[PDB]
Structure formats: C-alpha cells, structure tokens
Amino acid sequence: NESIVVEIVKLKNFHVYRGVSPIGVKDYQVGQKIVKSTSTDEHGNPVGLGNYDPHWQGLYAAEHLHHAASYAVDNNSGVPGGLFKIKLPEDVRFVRYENKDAAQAITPGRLYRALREEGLIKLTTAKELNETHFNSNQNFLTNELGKEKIILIDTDEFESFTDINGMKIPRLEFIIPWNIATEQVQVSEEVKVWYKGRDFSSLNAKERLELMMKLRGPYENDLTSYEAKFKDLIICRSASYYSSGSSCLDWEKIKTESQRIVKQIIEEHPELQSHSKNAVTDKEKLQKIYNDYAPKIDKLSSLKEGVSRATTALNIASWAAGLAETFSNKNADGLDKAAAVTAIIPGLGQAVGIANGIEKHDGEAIAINSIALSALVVAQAIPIVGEIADVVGAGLILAGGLAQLIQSVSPDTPPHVEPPHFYPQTSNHVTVGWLNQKIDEMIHAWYPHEGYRSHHFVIKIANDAPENTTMPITEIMAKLGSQTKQLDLVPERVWVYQNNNVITCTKQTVSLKTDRFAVIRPLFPTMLTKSRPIVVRMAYITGENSCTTDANPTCFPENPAIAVRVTPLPSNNECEWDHTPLHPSYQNGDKADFVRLGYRIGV
C-alpha cells in the first residue's frame, strides 16, 4: 500500500563510524557506552542529537570511515573534532527502507505504516500508535523504533552517483535511536581526535577561528588519506566488485613529486625566482618560460619520450596571464592559502588538461609533468602567493593546491553522470536544479505536521559551457524565516556530496536587517567539473509560524530560494554576506556570481 520498500538486513560488519564536533568529543570514551549529548547552543537547541525534530533524533553513523570524518567539525567555525568507530548490537533488527513515492517524502506516519504492513511492529497495535500520535508529538518516531529495537538504514532521496558504465557505489547511513545507542552501542576505537582543548563553548568566535587555522592542516591530510584508502580498496582493487579496470594513481606521491620538482627547478634558475615587483603578465614571456623548462620537467618527471604532455604553452600562458589580472588587486597580508587555490580554479580545465580525465598509460608521469609545469609558470605570473603567511614558496603552494584539486575529482576513475533535475537555472556556465519535481520544489510546512523538511538539488556544468570548464563552488545560501518558528536550518542534516566523498562545510545562520538566511561554505577548495557533479541536501524545520491561520493562508519565508556562488569569494566586502542573490529580483546570467534556484512553501 504505502509506496515504501522495507527489508530486514543482516549485517556482516557491525563496526560503523561517527564524526563528532569539538564539543561532542567528551561524550565518546573508548570502552564506554555512548552518552546522549546534553549540551545546547546559545539558542537552547541541542548539539549532536542528529536533528532538531525529535521524530528524527538519533545517533547518525556512516558505514564508511571517510564519510564520517567529513562530519567531524563544528558547524559554525569548522574546527575539527574527533572520529570514532562504534560497534552496533547484534541482537537488534536492522531495517532498510526506500521511498518509492515520487510525490511525497518520508514521514513518520508513512514509515510506521510501512513497518506495520511488513509485520515488524511487535509492541503496539495501529490503534495504540499511529499518525495521530506522531502529528500531536505524543510519540516520536525514533524513540518508538528504539523500543522496538530497530536501527534504521537509510539512503534518503539521493544515495550516490552512477558512473557512465552504469556502476553505483552504495552509500548507507545508520539511524540509531538514542535509547539503543546509550544502552547497547559501544565505542570500539578512537580513530583520531583533533580537538585537544577545554570547553569549546567557552571560546569566543575569534579564538574559534584561530583554532581552526591551526587544525585545518592536519585535518585536511587525515581526511584525504581516509578517502584515498577507500578509493584504493573499493574502486581500484581489481578483485573489488566496484573496480572498472582503472589505472589508479598515487596522488600523495604525485603531490610530493610535483612539489619537489618545482622547488628544485626554481631554486636552480634565478630567472624563475621572481618577486611581486617584477611579475611577468605578458602571454609571450610566459610561453617562453614554458618552452624553456618543459624539456627539463620532462626529464625530472620521468615522462616517456613521445608521450604527449597534457598541457600546451599557449593554454598555460593565457590561464596564468588571466590569473595575474584577478590576483593583481589583492594584498598578501590578507590572502588565505585556501583562497589562492580556489582563485586558480577559473580557467584551470582548459590549461591543465588532466582535470577532466587522464590517460591510462604513463599517467603518474603525465600528472607530475602537468602540475609541475602549471605551478612553475603560474608562480611567475602571481608571485604574491609566495608572500602568504606560512608558505615556503609560490611554486610549492601552487603545486600542492593543484594536486589537491585534481585529486578531488578523480580523473583516473570513470566519470559520474548527473541525476535528472527539474526547473533548472543557469549562471556562469553552472546549472542547478531540483532532484524531484514534487518533493523538492514544493515544501509543505504544516502537512503532515510541522517539523523536519529537506530537499535536494544538483550542481552541474551547463550544457553549452565550453569543454573542460571548471568552476569553484565557494558558497551556498538558503532563505530562512524572518521570524521565529517559520524556517530554521538544521545544520546536522545539511549535506554536500561530490565524487564519492562528503564535502566538509561550515553552516551558519546570518541576520541582515529583517532577513535571515543560511550560509554554507566548503571548508576546502571545491572544484566542479563535468565528470564530478555535486548534490546538495538543504535541511530545515518548520514551525507554528510558518503559515497564516486564515482562509487563504500565506506561508513564510516568502519567495524562498537557494543560491550557489560560482566565483571566488570577494576580499573587499564590508558586510561579508550579501543577501542579494536570494532576492527574487536577482538575475541569473552569463557573468553572475550566483545561480539562484527558487522554490515554494505552502501548507
């Protein structure tokens, strides 16, 4: 009856993983039962309970270690916390469900009806516990499931991308009710703890940022290593069901080799040891620098003779000359390392060549050759990046950032096909659209009852964009309610996914005049390519003020929308946040910094 597929799952691996924010590290002690967080934020909202809606509160665990590691940051500041392996009880029932209703998202009443129809609800009749109890908050979904000793396995409305061959790596999330978690779930291992401080809530906003700058380095390297270990085992090992015969590359070695070669070839030629006062912006001079040292980089990179370099003198020089224009109006004392790498994404695909894909023969040498050549020439065009605080050289930050960007899009594995989308909008060669016409474009604030709401949209390179277009995805905004109990963000459920990785993001609510809105920013530079589209889940809770109590009810926020920024964030903005792209008067276009995607909110 209820278009939901329900399956009882027998697990083979009972150890799952949980990323925690700095304030939640104290709740996870190895060898102890899990502690349900009693901490609250400044508004009184719980932190670490899985949702602001009690129906969906629980211990959310990821099957894969590298997915959970992406969650282990403080939402507002991005300070990394800790990562833990936890053991699930074997005496309970694991129930995977899948919504097959394209017109309606999952609700507590729908799920419990589907579970009753399969003979899974043992303790209550339909008269004792049905939708009327959930709609009146007399009973809550996950708490009732915990008494039934049920752990939910959930894929939501978007699981993972399918590649061009038709292969889809499964993504599983465990929703463990808190009564099961605190009584039967144990912390098996402390994988890694980054936050060593005392009372994170005592820190003010300033010193939270200082802590993040100290810890973002180690956390980035651990996360990348986790994702590289998963890719090697599941996607690269030929004996794995999900292998495609790909020639996977050692991207950590590629980074260190590219950085060593750039440093050596720069420190041996004073011509390449340029300062900001004698930067080279002429395309012709930059082409000669390419052609003078490309044969030397060929030998140092062990590139086989006859194997084509994925770069050309012309494209690298135009890209570098263009970056000199945009970097020209910037100061070194206020330029972030991550901002510099994000700023080289525009134009990167036309010049580097391996951002969209790399050949399966001599690939490791081609990658080192491309990154080393690109970093060498760009270092001459924008020498200001060598003056950033704590950079040892312009060529080293450019080579390291380039290798990091290219590794993130996995050019040595098959590309991903974007899901179909609805009501698309396009700006600056970037298209966004809702994943489901009826579920995502129209949010019902009060039916079945006020509470948790989420919708998905996809980010992709536009159809008519030039080949190899790469775009920086630097910010995601979402309209919120101007008054309380209308539309508030649920940052625990905001979710960004690219390739097979979760993109770590800060989430914060900002108030400008009478407007409230969410600001979601990836913690590390994020590059959109045709091979790696991006899916975003935006999550909210509605309330008793979401709509009016009159004959023709209007609902708030009015003119709801999300917006994706596709250009580097400005270094010259007085108020840091511009609410402009969320306003319905905003015009999507060829040169717009944002692409705005509106939706509707009714009863």
Numbering used by the authors: 4 to 606
Q: What do the authors of the reporting publication say about this deposited model?
A:
DT homologs from Streptomyces albireticuli (17% identity to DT) and Seinonella peptonophila (20% identity to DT), despite showing no toxicity toward human cells, display significant structural similarities to DT sharing both the overall Y-shaped architecture of DT as well as the individual folds of each domain. Moreover, each of the individual domains preserve their respective folds: the central split β-sheet motif in the catalytic domain characteristic of the ADP-ribosyl transferase (ADPRT) superfamily; the three-layered α-helical translocation domain; and, the Ig-like jelly-roll fold in the receptor-binding domain. Additionally, both DT homologs maintain the pinched disulfide loop at the junction between the C- and T-domains. Given these structural similarities, and for purposes of clarity and simplicity, we refer to these two DT homologs hereafter as Albireti Toxin (AT) and Peptono Toxin (PT). By striking contrast, we found that AT and PT do not display any measurable toxicity on Vero cells even at µM concentrations.
As crystals of the DT homolog from S. peptonophila were grown in a condition containing potassium iodide, a 2.2 Å dataset was collected with native protein crystals at a wavelength of 2.0 Å to maximize the anomalous signal from iodide. The structure was subsequently solved using iodide-SAD phasing. Whereas the homolog from S. albireticuli (S.a) displays a Tm comparable to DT (46.5 °C cf. 48.25 °C), the homolog from S. peptonophila (S.p) is significantly more thermostable (Tm = 59.5 °C). Of note, however, AT and PT contain both Cys residues (C217/C231 and C239/C251, respectively) that bound this region, and the crystal structures confirm formation of the inter-fragment disulfide bonds. In ATR and PTR, the 16 amino acid insertion between β9 and β10 contributes to an ~25 amino acid “lid,” hinging at ATG550 and ATN576 (PTP571 and PTD596), that folds back over and occludes the presumed receptor binding surface. By contrast, in AT and PT, only Y54 and E148 are absolutely conserved: in both, an Arginine is seen in place of the H21 residue; and in AT an Asparagine is seen in place of Y65. The T domain of PT contains three His residues: H272, H276, and H364. Two of these residues are structurally equivalent with His residues in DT: PTH272 ↔ DTH223 and PTH364 ↔ DTH322. Rather than forming π-stacking interactions with a second His residue as in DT, PTH272 forms an edge-to-face π–π interaction with PTY296.
